[PDB]
Amino acid sequence: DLTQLVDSCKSTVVWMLEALEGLSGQELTDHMGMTASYTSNLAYSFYSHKLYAEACAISEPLCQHLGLVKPGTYPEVPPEKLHRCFRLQVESLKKLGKQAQGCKMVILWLAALQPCSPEHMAEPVTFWVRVKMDAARAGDKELQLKTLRDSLSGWDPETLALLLREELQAYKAVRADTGQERFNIICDLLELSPEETPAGAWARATHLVELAQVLCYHDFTQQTNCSALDAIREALQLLDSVRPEAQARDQLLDDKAQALLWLYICTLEAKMQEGIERDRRAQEEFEVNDLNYEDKLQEDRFLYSNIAFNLAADAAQSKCLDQALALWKELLTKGQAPAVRCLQQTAASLQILAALYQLVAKPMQALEVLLLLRIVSERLKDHSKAAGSSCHITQLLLTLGCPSYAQLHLEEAASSLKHLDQTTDTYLLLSLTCDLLRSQLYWTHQKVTKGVSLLLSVLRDPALQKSSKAWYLLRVQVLQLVAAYLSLPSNNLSHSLWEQLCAQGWQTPEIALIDSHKLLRSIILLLMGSDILSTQKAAVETSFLDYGENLVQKWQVLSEVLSCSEKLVCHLGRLGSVSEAKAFCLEALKLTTKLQIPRQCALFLVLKGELELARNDIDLCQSDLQQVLFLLESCTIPNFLSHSPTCDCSLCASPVLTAVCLRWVLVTAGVRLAMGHQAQGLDLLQVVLKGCPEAAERLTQALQASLNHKTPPSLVPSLLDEILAQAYTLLALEGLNQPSNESLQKVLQSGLKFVAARIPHLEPWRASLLLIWALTKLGTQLFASSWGWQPPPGPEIMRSGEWELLRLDSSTLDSICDSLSVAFRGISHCPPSGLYAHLCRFLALCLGHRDPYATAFLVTESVSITCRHQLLTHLHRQLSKAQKHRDVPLARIQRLFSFRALESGHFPQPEKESFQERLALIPSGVTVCVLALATLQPGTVGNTLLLTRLEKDSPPVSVQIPTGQNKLHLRSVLNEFDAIQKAQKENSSCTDKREWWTGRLALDHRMEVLIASLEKSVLGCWKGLLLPSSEEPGPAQEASRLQELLQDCGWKYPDRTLLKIMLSGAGALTPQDIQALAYGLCPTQPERAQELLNEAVGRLQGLTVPSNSHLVLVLDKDLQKLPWESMPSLQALPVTRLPSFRFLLSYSIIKEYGASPVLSQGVDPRSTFYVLNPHNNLSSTEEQFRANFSSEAGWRGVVGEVPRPEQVQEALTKHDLYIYAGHGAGARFLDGQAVLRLSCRAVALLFGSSSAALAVHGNLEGAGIVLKYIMAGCPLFLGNLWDVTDRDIDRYTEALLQGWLGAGPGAPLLYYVNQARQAPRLKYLIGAAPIAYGLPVSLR
């Protein structure tokens, strides 16, 4: 058909070919050129029609003419035309899928292009590599053996070298493993270069560095018998002894520069290999109480390799990099165009150097490299590379805190982006990046409304989820931007935009940051494997595949991993989650030890020293700080103190390492301020006040010289502002303890101007300074007028990351209240644990009974905040897993615990609306009592107690008890309790019966006096608020009559409910209780009020019956130690304690969706797992319980052996009862993290020492394994508050088990808990110890 017609045309074309034949002269060549262009037109049609055969007919004549052209020399009759025509023929051979004749035919293409300058032979080699690759892809090894040298074998040896160089460069662009092919070419290249001619020494040197790149990532030493380091040092020796010509001095540079750069990389890789080898070869009777199990599990295999750093090689290493920058600076900054061979390899190498500088934390010199990269891209006219470099510059400048210089480079990227094609992936990726940069620029310049709009559109772009390593890195930066918006106060953004942001999936900033950290570790695993950081062998070793972009991405990912850890550690430390932060700090320290970077190590040691200070561990804090000094002093009262603001020392020229030094003085002052050395900590803190503005000035001065802008960058950058704010906080805190010194007073105002000028970035520090303002103005008291009540035997034994798989690259009072309102709204979205409690309780005192509902919400909001943060992080992991597998109960729990689930308005209207909804959810028959103490001075224990009683269909009731007036202060009770605990440890050492028993008996009497002191001295008459109410209509009527009469007696705030609760317990109202109540409530006429109360109490007496109900206690960090359950009044009621008020409502949500079989149905006695005597040192315990436990029906367990973790998981998830008799809470068998990941269904009866005890370290909140059990859904948890001896605690276990189990179906556990307290001989030292966490349970 058309092909047959083409055959006829080919016949005419053959006649035309014959016509061109014989014809001689440029005119004949012109006629031949016309025929060639016609053949090109015919080939265009044939190619379009895939008529390879028809094109091949013309190609056959053309190939013959190509062979004829090879005979002798022919002028460039068809420049590019010949290449394009031959390209069609090669494409036709590719269309024929036959590559055997393709490679010989590219030879004819090479033969046709023979007498030309090196730029001309650049296209055939790309095809030559390409026809090689697809044939190699199928597996044609024979064609792989064919390279240019043997194929040609007929060329000028010098020109053959340049052809071989082009093949090597083309092989780097191939996105597959090409180590062996590249190695073959280099060996042929080395053979050609003579070893005696001075010009041959140059060629030998250039070829040697290519071998170093191949050997650095491939083990080919079995063939070349030379290591990477020896070859690279051999190259430098040859380069040193060269005296070049003036024309080629440009090429001497970029050869010496590339050699020095690759000296650094291959010596760095050797150090990393050595570290992994050292690591791989490299790989406790406190059981009485495991409260510190995690602390010991952090290990001590540190602080040794840290001193193995800072050897003189580190500076010697940095000398190589700095000299390479100097040489490349000379070559490029000159006006004249460069004369190098491949400017692309110069551009590619510069990107690797730029990335390495950021890894070693030298960002200023990384900015110089990126400026030169843009210079190369402008000459190369590659618009994609110019935009990429400009985006990196803007990202770098923002981190340094310079929003002014960031904008110009952001706009330069936009202009260069237009020249690109709008359909490629590069355009889409770069457009999204610039919008992300613009969104961050809006956030820094206080334009949040438009910034949120841009970010939302970026998050809603369908292309962001494309599977590639470049997209994964953009996703990481998107998540870090989300945390920036999630850190803002509520007033910045409207309710509509807040809902849209939280609907994406991230609630709190730490959740977003943790998700970013997970993604980065996934990229590392997808790139280099996990041996670099995971420390454990993953039973597989992946390749690295250095194809150019993989090499630069390798160093970029590592830098961002360290950068992410810094933000995560600082933010988690500020909230109060010290334990979680130390895990991130230690993992980052391990990475920096393997890379051997002293600069990054010093920064992370400083942060760890800050964390240890918050836990009141001075010895470890002092150990860390001295390690910093050795690293700092060898790298460059410390010597760096008192430095002029022009110092060019290695520690006086870099902003990163100046911040490390500034934090050192702050942490050093904190240690001295806690050790009693005032006037030295104050003097130290003055230096940080002086230093920070000076440091910013030098960085501002230096940034100008680097970028060569004209004006100073408008406002001074903002990177040391956080340090200056914390320094200003500490100084004002010591002003309270020394109010005599008027000098510290101006600091409080001087600090406030600094913080108020940078709203809304230093908002947490603004809140702290406002709180000190309230306390300074503050100094019963002035809070009295807001409240309605004014005060009138043988010694016994004492018992890290989750990687994810990624797809292939394929009046004074009013002023104080108004001031605190501003501070509360600045931190409520993400409250720190310490500050929030102080603010809420202080505000609650001032509001008093002027607003009962706001008072109840404030007191409720101030307890167990760190648990609330950890629960929200836990829920995100739960919901994310469900989405991975493929949730209504989880969604409602998130809204219950969220911080931003509020409407708009003035304080406190939205909170009262949200609080009223929560009250309506309270189950019937439950009384919720909150006990917390108000601390006026932060850092000390207060003497004022707050009590709130919450019930269904009843307004909240609150009351204040000041204990400083009477003897037996609340601090005295707390001090006495700790004195008993210390004497218990000392008495255990004695080894005689008489002194042991006599001492133990005395301790029991002291505990009895303390418990009775709680009821009489502390609670007084207000113990009635803890007892339940009554259902008879008697009390309500009497309160109705008494309310009017009591108002005329002088009661400021008459409340109907308070009298009703107190009149219900009229049976136990002692006559002394009446006097305390009557005098406080009615100061005007105390005698008259006594008459009415006595008249009313007498009538109600005998006519009251107690009801069946439940009491739940919520206690703060200090009051949770004391045994409230063992008070004389509460020895007849079921009492449990919960972490917070919201936890009670969480059980109701879970209970309705059928997720708690124990609460819904009951406990089946035939589902029990016991762990008895695991460590085999409690013989008397075993013989008292072995026989009883074994004979029971359906009971399984482990005796005398350590259980496996798999056994314990089945017990908690599938069995109903878990009994542990041994040392501690069994944290070793099941740690805290393992408990959190499972759904706990069983009831935990852990009879170990200090199992249900929360450790209070410093001002941080309590921690323990009991919180993990409650957060996993445990119905009830039973444990001990202090240490107990085995023989007595065995009696308690016996009484509780025999009584409860033998009681029959339908028996409540709490009733028999109180019964068993009488079994032990020491009824107040051992009997009071067991407590219950959770909700009451029963048998089926």
Question: Which residue ranges make up the site for Zn ion (CB under 5 A)?
Answer: 643, 647, 649, 652
Whose Cβ is closer to Zn ion: residue 653's or residue 968's? 653
Whose Cβ is closer to Zn ion: residue 112's or residue 631's? 631
Nearest to 176 by CA among 540, 530, 550: 550
Whose Cβ is closer to Zn ion: residue 644's or residue 811's? 644
Whose Cβ is closer to Zn ion: residue 324's or residue 695's? 695
- Residue facing Zn ion at closest CB distance: 647
Shortest CB 646 distance to Zn ion, Å = 8
For 208, other C-beta atoms within 10 Å of its C-beta total 25
Shortest CB 643 distance to Zn ion, Å = 4
Shortest CB 642 distance to Zn ion, Å = 10
Alpha-carbon Rg of the chain, whole angstroms? 40
Whose Cβ is closer to Zn ion: residue 16's or residue 652's? 652
Question: What are 330-333's contacts with CB under 8 Å, separation 24+?
Answer: 330/253, 331/250, 331/253, 331/254, 331/257, 332/372, 332/375, 332/376, 333/372, 333/375
Burial class (CB within 10 angstroms; exposed 0-12, middle 13-18, buried 19+) of 443: buried
For 544, other C-beta atoms within 10 Å of its C-beta total 15
Q: Characterize the bridge pairing of strands 957-962 and 1110-1115.
A: unpaired
- Which of the 8 DSSP states describes residue 1278? E
Shortest CB 389 distance to Zn ion, Å = 32
Whose Cβ is closer to Zn ion: residue 691's or residue 1080's? 691
Whose Cβ is closer to Zn ion: residue 640's or residue 1277's? 640
Whose Cβ is closer to Zn ion: residue 313's or residue 649's? 649
Shortest CB 652 distance to Zn ion, Å = 3
Shortest CB 697 distance to Zn ion, Å = 14
d(CA 353, CA 905) in angstroms, rounded, equals 53
d(CA 721, CA 726) in angstroms, rounded, equals 9
Q: How far is CA 198 from CA 193, 232, 1162, in A?
A: 11, 19, 93
Shortest CB 688 distance to Zn ion, Å = 17
Token duo for residue 2: 């058309």
Shortest CB 705 distance to Zn ion, Å = 18
Shortest CB 698 distance to Zn ion, Å = 10
Q: Is 724:752 a contact under the CB 8 Å cutoff?
A: no
Whose Cβ is closer to Zn ion: residue 702's or residue 784's? 702
Shortest CB 696 distance to Zn ion, Å = 16
Shortest CB 811 distance to Zn ion, Å = 53
Nearest to 92 by CA among 123, 66, 118, 58: 58
Nearest to 938 by CA among 670, 668, 1262, 1258: 1258
Whose Cβ is closer to Zn ion: residue 652's or residue 727's? 652
Whose Cβ is closer to Zn ion: residue 5's or residue 641's? 641
Q: How far is CA 1283 from CA 285, 475, 995, 1001, 1232, in A?
A: 14, 51, 19, 15, 21
Q: How far is CA 619 from CA 95, 616, 622, in A?
A: 75, 9, 5
For 965, other C-beta atoms within 10 Å of its C-beta total 10
Whose Cβ is closer to Zn ion: residue 652's or residue 1082's? 652
Nearest to 210 by CA among 224, 196, 194: 224
d(CA 263, CA 251) in angstroms, rounded, equals 19
Q: How far is CA 664 from CA 359, 583, 603, 669, 989, in A?
A: 22, 21, 9, 9, 42
Shortest CB 365 distance to Zn ion, Å = 18
Which residue type sits at 905?
Answer: G
d(CA 446, CA 451) in angstroms, rounded, equals 9
Shortest CB 633 distance to Zn ion, Å = 13
Nearest to 1271 by CA among 866, 989, 790: 866
Whose Cβ is closer to Zn ion: residue 40's or residue 658's? 658
Whose Cβ is closer to Zn ion: residue 695's or residue 1297's? 695
Q: Is 211:231 a contact under the CB 8 Å cutoff?
A: yes
Shortest CB 1228 distance to Zn ion, Å = 51
Q: How far is CA 224 from CA 183, 190, 943, 1299, in A?
A: 10, 12, 80, 82
Whose Cβ is closer to Zn ion: residue 94's or residue 643's? 643
Shortest CB 590 distance to Zn ion, Å = 32
Which residues are CB-contacts of 723 (< 8 A; sequence separation ≥ 6)? 659, 662, 663, 666, 688, 692
**Helix 812-827 with 833-847: angle, nearest 10 deg:** 150
DSSP SS3 for 1169: strand
Whose Cβ is closer to Zn ion: residue 643's or residue 1196's? 643
d(CA 1174, CA 1245) in angstroms, rounded, equals 16
Looking up tokens 């189950």 gives 923
Shortest CB 649 distance to Zn ion, Å = 4
Whose Cβ is closer to Zn ion: residue 691's or residue 852's? 691
Q: Is 672:680 a contact under the CB 8 Å cutoff?
A: yes
d(CA 603, CA 757) in angstroms, rounded, equals 28
Which residues are CB-contacts of 96 (< 8 A; sequence separation ≥ 6)? 52, 56
- Which of the 8 DSSP states describes residue 341? S
d(CA 1207, CA 1222) in angstroms, rounded, equals 17
d(CA 864, CA 1263) in angstroms, rounded, equals 10
Shortest CB 651 distance to Zn ion, Å = 7
Whose Cβ is closer to Zn ion: residue 679's or residue 705's? 705
Shortest CB 397 distance to Zn ion, Å = 25
